[PDB]
Amino acid sequence: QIVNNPKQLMHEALKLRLNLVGGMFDTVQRSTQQTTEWAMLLLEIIISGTVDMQSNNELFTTVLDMLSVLINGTLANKRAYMNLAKKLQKELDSLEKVRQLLPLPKQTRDVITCEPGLQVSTKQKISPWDLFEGLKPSAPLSWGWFGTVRVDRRVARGEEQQRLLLYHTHLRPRPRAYYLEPL
Amino acid sequence: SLEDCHCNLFCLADLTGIKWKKYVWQGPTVTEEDPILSSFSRCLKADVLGVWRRDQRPGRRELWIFWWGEDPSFADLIHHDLSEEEDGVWENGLSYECRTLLFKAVHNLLERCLMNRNFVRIGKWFVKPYSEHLSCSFTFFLHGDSNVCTSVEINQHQPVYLLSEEHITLAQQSNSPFQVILCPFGLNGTLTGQAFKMSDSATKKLIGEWKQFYPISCSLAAVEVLVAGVRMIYPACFVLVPQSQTVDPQSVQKWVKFSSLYVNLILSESVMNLFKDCNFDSCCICVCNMNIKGADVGVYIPQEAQYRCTCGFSAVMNRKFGNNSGLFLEDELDIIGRNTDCGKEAEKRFEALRALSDDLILLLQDQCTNLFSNWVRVEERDCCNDCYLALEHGRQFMDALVKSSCLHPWSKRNQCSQDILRMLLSLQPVLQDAIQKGVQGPLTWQQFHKMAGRSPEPLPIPTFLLGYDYDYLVLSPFALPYWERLMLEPYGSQRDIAYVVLCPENEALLNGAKSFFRDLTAIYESCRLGQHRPVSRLLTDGIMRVGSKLKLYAQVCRYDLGPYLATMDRDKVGIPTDGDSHYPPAIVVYIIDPFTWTLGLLRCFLEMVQTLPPHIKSTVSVQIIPCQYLLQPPQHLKSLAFSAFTQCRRPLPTSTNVKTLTGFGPGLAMETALRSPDRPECIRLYAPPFILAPVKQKYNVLFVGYCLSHDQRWILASCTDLYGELLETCIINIDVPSARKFGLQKLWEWCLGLVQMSSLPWRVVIGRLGRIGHGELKDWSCLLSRRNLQSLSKRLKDMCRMCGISAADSPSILSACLVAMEPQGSFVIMPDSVSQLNTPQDTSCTHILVFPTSASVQPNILQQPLALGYFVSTAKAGPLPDWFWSACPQAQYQCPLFLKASLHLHVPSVQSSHPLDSNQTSDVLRFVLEQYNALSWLTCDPATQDRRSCLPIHFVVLNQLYNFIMNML
Amino acid sequence: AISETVDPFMEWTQIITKYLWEQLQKMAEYYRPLPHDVEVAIRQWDYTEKLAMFMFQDGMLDRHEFLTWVLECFEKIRPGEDELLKLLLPLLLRYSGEFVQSAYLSRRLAYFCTRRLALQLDPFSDLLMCPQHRPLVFGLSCILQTILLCCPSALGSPLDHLPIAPSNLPMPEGNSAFTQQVRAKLREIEQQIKERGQAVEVRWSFTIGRVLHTLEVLDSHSFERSDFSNSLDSLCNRIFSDDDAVVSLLCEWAVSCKRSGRHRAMVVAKLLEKRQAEIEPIFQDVLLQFLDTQAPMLTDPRSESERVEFFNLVLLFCELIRHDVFSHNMYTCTLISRGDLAF
Ligand SMILES: [Zn+2]
Ligand SMILES: [Zn+2]
């Protein structure tokens, strides 16, 4: 009902539920896979935007406390900790606090493919171990991602204009100190 | 993209078929007898658009009535003595005066409806008394040919409580005066506590008269309140009572350490009567009379007889944006007034802000050339000076303190995207009912762009030019972070650099220097930027050591570096010598700065250059690196490597090596022409790492922008080419204790000096970083006149024979243009609300929209804004000068910036198809703004994913130069 | 290529940690009985650590495993070996940015940091004199401050072992303003976590039930058998927030005087009457104002039950005065001063 939708009457409707699971947390940690089953339930209701910082500053804090020792209950196995960490991230300012509970993730370089007016289409992820300068061509990178075109060399436009100026003999410019003088 | 994000806009109504009539009264040189107020209240109850105002002639007041379709009953709503003087329809044209009055008429009905929905008004704000309780302010503008639109500004304010019996009880026992918010206009008053009862005879009549104009609910009735030392009985329904990024600095600190109805009736004709089109914010001198005063402002601002100001100027709003914004002191004082009050405060502040060598300044502006590096508002005083007029007018009927705190500071005392849009959809029914008694909700950019009567797609991303092989390469700007992996090469042929480092004799700082520059050499050479080896003489890895202590830092600095810069071949036997066959390396002096002043360090460079032979001095550069980089915490190395390469500026050769070996010939003719006295010295050609790729006679476009420093003593200017090939900056001294016309003449000479060094016709587009003045427009119109630009074309022909034969080679000027950039501060777009990639997080986008912005519908200077265009950009803008955001400081922090670009001169086809030569002023802006976006992509830091800052590159360098002068001076 | 006939992040991170683990062992045992092998270790420790830092910024080796090894090296530091610790403190400052992005690592780091600070005290003024202990205290206090500021979800709590609050922890010198601002932010955030921890202490779950707790302990035996433990000789000898909780216990039985028991209802009056018996300045308050509100049905004297139950209260009121709990001299001087200002 909340996700498809008496402005704030449902907030207290859930803090009693928080008191329910606050009472029966000790029952939850007794089993092994039952730790996850009501761990995941509260995830989908938080991420939906049912509660934000402006609604109840303390409300958000209360669910976090429960979340720390559900994860601390994994260690006290470590592997079970990872077993659920991969199952928690597989779905995904308020997000800053949520991700702090999970472990540090692996980072990969991202390249932005333009694919042409000349707009941007997609983004590609490449591991940082494939980017080395020993190979002459680009193995992970493709030149067609950036819309590369090879064009023949030409003399610089600025250099040529200096040469063509020799036939003109216009007025001599100011010594660049004429501007920084009293009026 | 932002083509589906929600704005805060509402297409209120359509002006087709509208009709209006004007009724005028003349009086002597009680509200029931008055015909203007009796008719205004009577038509307001019937819910028809009505508005009244005063006229220049004393004792003259006029009432306007707007309606749609069928006429209302005019035999009853109009008093007997009132006589009409104007009967117009939409097909007969809508002047600006009518346009500004229609906006207030809509706001009159809108204000009435809002108070019926439990909204209380405090000045410009409408808030709900006790988050989804947010204050919203309405401003109007006419968008499109005939559609009338509004923009809602939503802000967070502290809670406000309606006055009740409980509040009064504690006031009587309180010795201190009780502070409360009064009126729809937010007056500041003290609650005396002498509450009234509705049964009283006085409040029977007082409330009865109040109900005629404002909708008052229906028990407490009224209360005595004292405002600004003047007491008055005021109804208790309208009274209100108020409620009354570090981790990095900290850890850096650590690293450093260890290593009454009559009164409110008059006010509504002065404070809220000003409801003008927001498109005409960028305006200047009145074209009709060549003055800064016009329209009906002669009655709102304290003779001369202006005649029929048809244009859209409004001096009331001119003083708002032209008080602290970057303007010439000569132009600003005209807007305010020297003889009147507040003229001395501006002069006193300017002098108090103030309270060396010429060649030092020239060195300073060379370092910023590279691509990589209170006052009470006048409009507020106007409201305070309006209190005295209204209160003294009101007090007469009954028979410094006021200017200080007449108005409650609640409106001056200060988010999320979901909650804001919740109120925006909440406000749609209110707007729907008010006009109807349809309206589109918060418009997306696509809907906003579609009804402008003119594509909502983002501007295309330009491609760059690089060198992969010995040939060129057209590459996307997103491939810059992989410069080393793809082994690309820049322009300028990899200039070679030999460096000297000055380091103190501290082991901790010495050891770090060797490793840092060893890493710098690797990244410099890994990129195809050339060779970064030190000076060929080997003295302990090319590091020179030194040894209050700045004096010790200078003696060895000058005594050592001054003079310093002033047959077996086993493997060679196999290969023969190639032959004699047919560019000295640049010298860079790296300076480490132990100090956490700097000029003390730059004083070496001033002393070294004078004691050096000319050929060595022509290529010598200085770089200063702080000592904290070596010790404490890489993207710094890539930025430093590219900055050093860009600053090289390889000099033009002084000899051709023809070896004529004969009396005379074509080779000698080039040589003797190369050494002519009129040829300038130190050409110093500029070659950047990359330039914009060309896009399909020959010409060029010069983009120049300028702004004054924090003091008006200096004019800072910068320039760039169409493709970013050239980039130069200038500083002009204007310090007189006429003062600006000479300064602008020097600037125009500098711009003329650049175009005349080429051999192809140019096009000039002039930009202004801030708001254009009212005198600068007059001065620029004289310099950039048709007669003038044509005259210098003929004067050029006389001097040069070569220009005489071929006109395609003479560096004449084909067109001129003046454009001013300033923020808007009225519209806001939230990227979070929608309707594969998420634009604001990982990409930069930019949309534009330009329209002719005519003053009315259906000699040298025409109307003030010729054409106007919005500049919506997701990418952040750099640190702008403080006066840039003075008008609308709230828009400074929003992520998608709104900027306004205006046209002022547009001199087309001087010599007699490019967009700059089209007489349609809308085509000129979309060409200038499109090139403004394209030049903004040259700011993409190779160490960074996207462009570091918004706008054109020339604007960005000018801003960097402004802060550099500000910080060190 | 040859192994084609595996995550590079995990394997290459393990090699560096194993290689760097050997360097620390060499340095530690050689300081206690300069040797040449230390210089060989020092050069390789200095360079390889700088190489690992660069690869960390490049994101080439796994962050979680590398950071986990760092804390394992910081928990093996011998007690009192500040020197060895000092050559490792800059590792914390360099990697302080990514420590606050996880709660597992911050909790491990805070418990290491809090315990170490307590050992050094047995305060800050004497330590700052020593050039050796000058950066350690500031380094340790700064890493603890930035943990809660950016990562509050990681804080029973590590702060339990620390006797001093982070609000008044020693701070680097220089700016008076900045230091005061950050101190205010730190103290308010510390209070935020202090109340959050209390809230979690009750697992997200007054005076009437207190007597019911004491009812069952007497009910374990027979009430007829007057045991030896009801007397205060055992209670007061082994002992001498109980005064504030016992004022309700005496009065609640007193108003419910329909139950009997008088000669066994004075032993608890002996407990708290001795604290105020030596008076012959402060005065016990809010006592008599409570009781006169609980007087029921004063308007109607037709019912005899409201009279005799109130008559029992006066007898309870008479006997409590002789126990000397409600003082009279400071009460009557207020009554003396009540009419003095009226005249
Ligand atoms: Zn010429
Ligand atoms: Zn005009």
Tab-separated table of C-alpha atoms in Angstrom, chain B residues 383-585:
chain	number	residue	atom	x	y	z
B	383	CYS	CA	11.233	48.787	1.109
B	384	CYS	CA	12.412	50.449	4.332
B	385	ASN	CA	12.007	53.901	2.776
B	386	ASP	CA	8.505	52.808	1.747
B	387	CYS	CA	7.547	52.233	5.396
B	388	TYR	CA	7.956	55.928	6.216
B	389	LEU	CA	5.792	57.005	3.274
B	390	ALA	CA	2.962	54.611	4.149
B	391	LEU	CA	3.032	55.027	7.936
B	392	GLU	CA	3.152	58.829	7.767
B	393	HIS	CA	0.352	58.781	5.188
B	394	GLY	CA	-1.692	56.479	7.415
B	395	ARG	CA	-1.008	58.449	10.596
B	396	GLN	CA	-2.150	61.715	8.998
B	397	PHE	CA	-5.604	60.223	8.379
B	398	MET	CA	-6.325	59.440	12.035
B	399	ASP	CA	-4.971	62.695	13.531
B	400	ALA	CA	16.109	56.280	11.650
B	401	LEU	CA	14.206	53.764	13.766
B	402	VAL	CA	11.680	53.144	10.980
B	403	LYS	CA	14.374	52.668	8.323
B	404	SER	CA	16.280	50.191	10.526
B	405	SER	CA	13.870	47.391	11.499
B	406	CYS	CA	10.493	48.134	9.915
B	407	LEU	CA	10.383	44.714	8.235
B	408	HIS	CA	10.609	41.426	10.105
B	409	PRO	CA	13.895	39.555	9.471
B	410	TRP	CA	11.848	36.336	9.199
B	411	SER	CA	11.811	36.568	5.396
B	412	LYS	CA	15.624	36.880	5.379
B	413	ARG	CA	16.185	33.789	7.563
B	414	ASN	CA	16.581	30.382	5.915
B	415	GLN	CA	16.917	20.166	0.637
B	416	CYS	CA	15.122	17.308	-1.110
B	417	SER	CA	13.476	16.653	-4.466
B	418	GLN	CA	10.473	14.514	-3.498
B	419	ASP	CA	8.977	16.933	-0.963
B	420	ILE	CA	9.378	19.956	-3.250
B	421	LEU	CA	7.485	18.244	-6.072
B	422	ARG	CA	4.784	17.168	-3.604
B	423	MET	CA	3.924	20.832	-3.059
B	424	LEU	CA	4.226	21.654	-6.770
B	425	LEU	CA	1.461	19.163	-7.569
B	426	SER	CA	-0.408	20.459	-4.517
B	427	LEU	CA	-0.397	23.976	-5.992
B	428	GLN	CA	-1.849	22.931	-9.363
B	429	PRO	CA	-5.516	22.750	-8.206
B	430	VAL	CA	-5.193	26.197	-6.601
B	431	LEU	CA	-3.932	27.703	-9.859
B	432	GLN	CA	-6.555	25.731	-11.801
B	433	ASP	CA	-9.495	27.007	-9.751
B	434	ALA	CA	-8.355	30.637	-9.558
B	435	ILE	CA	-8.208	31.284	-13.307
B	436	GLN	CA	-11.216	29.104	-14.172
B	437	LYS	CA	-13.553	30.541	-11.515
B	438	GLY	CA	-6.572	24.550	-18.373
B	439	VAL	CA	-3.434	24.812	-16.237
B	440	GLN	CA	-0.486	22.505	-16.851
B	441	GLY	CA	1.406	21.223	-13.831
B	442	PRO	CA	5.163	21.458	-13.286
B	443	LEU	CA	6.437	21.428	-16.845
B	444	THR	CA	9.225	19.212	-18.101
B	445	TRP	CA	11.971	20.790	-20.183
B	446	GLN	CA	10.531	19.174	-23.315
B	447	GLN	CA	7.124	20.749	-22.669
B	448	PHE	CA	8.722	24.067	-21.705
B	449	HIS	CA	10.816	24.059	-24.887
B	450	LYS	CA	7.923	22.936	-27.104
B	451	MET	CA	5.675	25.909	-26.301
B	452	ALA	CA	8.424	28.480	-26.917
B	453	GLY	CA	7.236	28.529	-30.543
B	454	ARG	CA	10.663	27.806	-32.019
B	455	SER	CA	15.239	20.826	-30.307
B	456	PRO	CA	15.137	19.753	-26.643
B	457	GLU	CA	17.993	17.301	-27.237
B	458	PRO	CA	21.257	18.151	-25.447
B	459	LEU	CA	23.929	19.995	-27.374
B	460	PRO	CA	26.292	17.562	-29.136
B	461	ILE	CA	29.665	16.681	-27.638
B	462	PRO	CA	32.492	17.987	-29.857
B	463	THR	CA	35.513	15.955	-30.909
B	464	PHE	CA	39.154	16.888	-30.371
B	465	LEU	CA	42.298	16.842	-32.503
B	466	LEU	CA	45.347	14.875	-31.355
B	467	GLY	CA	48.244	12.932	-32.803
B	468	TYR	CA	48.260	9.148	-32.537
B	469	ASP	CA	50.865	8.389	-35.186
B	470	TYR	CA	52.857	11.076	-36.987
B	471	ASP	CA	49.405	11.905	-38.424
B	472	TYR	CA	46.521	13.691	-36.691
B	473	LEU	CA	43.567	12.051	-34.942
B	474	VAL	CA	39.948	13.084	-34.346
B	475	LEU	CA	39.109	11.697	-30.913
B	476	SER	CA	36.328	11.939	-28.355
B	477	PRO	CA	37.010	13.992	-25.199
B	478	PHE	CA	36.280	10.921	-23.051
B	479	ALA	CA	39.514	9.236	-24.210
B	480	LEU	CA	41.739	11.775	-22.429
B	481	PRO	CA	42.166	9.706	-19.202
B	482	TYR	CA	43.708	6.936	-21.360
B	483	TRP	CA	46.296	9.270	-22.894
B	484	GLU	CA	49.244	7.083	-21.888
B	485	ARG	CA	47.586	3.726	-22.620
B	486	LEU	CA	46.669	4.763	-26.177
B	487	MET	CA	50.076	6.507	-26.580
B	488	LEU	CA	48.687	9.693	-28.093
B	489	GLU	CA	50.775	12.755	-28.917
B	490	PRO	CA	49.874	16.442	-28.512
B	491	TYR	CA	50.340	19.531	-30.663
B	492	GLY	CA	53.641	21.443	-30.594
B	493	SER	CA	55.937	18.457	-31.260
B	494	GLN	CA	56.816	17.385	-27.676
B	495	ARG	CA	58.855	20.426	-26.468
B	496	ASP	CA	61.946	19.358	-24.477
B	497	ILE	CA	62.450	20.737	-20.969
B	498	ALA	CA	65.531	21.091	-18.763
B	499	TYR	CA	64.782	21.891	-15.132
B	500	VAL	CA	66.502	23.254	-12.029
B	501	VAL	CA	65.112	22.674	-8.530
B	502	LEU	CA	65.674	24.870	-5.465
B	503	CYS	CA	65.377	22.914	-2.213
B	504	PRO	CA	66.420	23.644	1.385
B	505	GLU	CA	69.115	21.598	3.100
B	506	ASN	CA	66.628	19.515	5.098
B	507	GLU	CA	66.976	15.759	4.684
B	508	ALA	CA	63.229	15.116	4.921
B	509	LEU	CA	62.429	17.665	2.204
B	510	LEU	CA	65.470	16.863	0.042
B	511	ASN	CA	64.780	13.126	-0.235
B	512	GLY	CA	61.165	13.723	-1.240
B	513	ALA	CA	62.236	16.135	-3.978
B	514	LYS	CA	64.378	13.536	-5.760
B	515	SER	CA	61.601	10.934	-5.870
B	516	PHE	CA	58.857	13.379	-6.874
B	517	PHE	CA	60.741	14.735	-9.889
B	518	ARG	CA	61.931	11.250	-10.842
B	519	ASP	CA	58.261	10.263	-11.029
B	520	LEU	CA	57.468	13.481	-12.913
B	521	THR	CA	60.055	12.641	-15.578
B	522	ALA	CA	58.452	9.229	-16.123
B	523	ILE	CA	54.892	10.508	-16.561
B	524	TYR	CA	56.109	13.405	-18.720
B	525	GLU	CA	57.919	11.022	-21.075
B	526	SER	CA	55.267	8.283	-20.926
B	527	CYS	CA	52.969	10.822	-22.498
B	528	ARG	CA	54.485	11.870	-25.823
B	529	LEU	CA	55.341	15.291	-24.403
B	530	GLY	CA	59.079	15.166	-25.119
B	531	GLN	CA	62.081	14.854	-22.802
B	532	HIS	CA	62.044	16.101	-19.201
B	533	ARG	CA	65.711	15.494	-18.396
B	534	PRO	CA	67.417	18.083	-16.152
B	535	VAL	CA	70.110	20.541	-17.219
B	536	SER	CA	72.780	18.487	-18.959
B	537	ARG	CA	75.405	19.342	-16.336
B	538	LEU	CA	75.237	16.620	-13.675
B	539	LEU	CA	75.196	18.081	-10.147
B	540	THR	CA	73.502	15.519	-7.871
B	541	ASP	CA	70.402	14.854	-9.993
B	542	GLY	CA	70.125	18.490	-11.083
B	543	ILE	CA	68.994	19.846	-7.699
B	544	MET	CA	70.370	23.148	-6.395
B	545	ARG	CA	70.267	23.696	-2.640
B	546	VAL	CA	70.054	26.868	-0.565
B	547	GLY	CA	72.178	27.785	2.430
B	548	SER	CA	63.840	36.245	7.528
B	549	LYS	CA	65.047	33.078	5.805
B	550	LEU	CA	63.687	34.400	2.498
B	551	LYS	CA	66.783	36.620	2.423
B	552	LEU	CA	68.935	33.492	2.628
B	553	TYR	CA	66.592	32.044	0.001
B	554	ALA	CA	67.482	34.976	-2.300
B	555	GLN	CA	71.254	35.497	-2.000
B	556	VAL	CA	72.126	31.998	-3.221
B	557	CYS	CA	69.135	32.254	-5.567
B	558	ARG	CA	70.687	35.160	-7.499
B	559	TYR	CA	74.429	34.616	-6.976
B	560	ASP	CA	74.304	30.995	-8.207
B	561	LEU	CA	71.586	30.690	-10.865
B	562	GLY	CA	72.420	34.059	-12.422
B	563	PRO	CA	75.815	33.160	-13.879
B	564	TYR	CA	74.713	29.522	-14.207
B	565	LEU	CA	72.214	30.242	-16.995
B	566	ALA	CA	74.439	32.844	-18.696
B	567	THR	CA	87.896	11.350	-29.856
B	568	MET	CA	87.023	7.660	-29.544
B	569	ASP	CA	83.740	6.571	-31.168
B	570	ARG	CA	83.467	2.781	-30.959
B	571	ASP	CA	79.864	2.345	-32.112
B	572	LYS	CA	80.018	5.131	-34.714
B	573	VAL	CA	82.526	3.373	-36.996
B	574	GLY	CA	79.933	1.098	-38.597
B	575	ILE	CA	77.513	3.802	-39.741
B	576	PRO	CA	78.501	6.722	-41.998
B	577	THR	CA	77.540	10.256	-41.062
B	578	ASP	CA	74.224	11.362	-42.548
B	579	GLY	CA	75.366	14.906	-43.280
B	580	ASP	CA	74.906	18.485	-42.170
B	581	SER	CA	71.208	18.321	-43.200
B	582	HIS	CA	69.370	21.507	-42.112
B	583	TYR	CA	64.875	24.917	-31.214
B	584	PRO	CA	66.716	25.105	-27.886
B	585	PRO	CA	65.121	23.211	-24.990
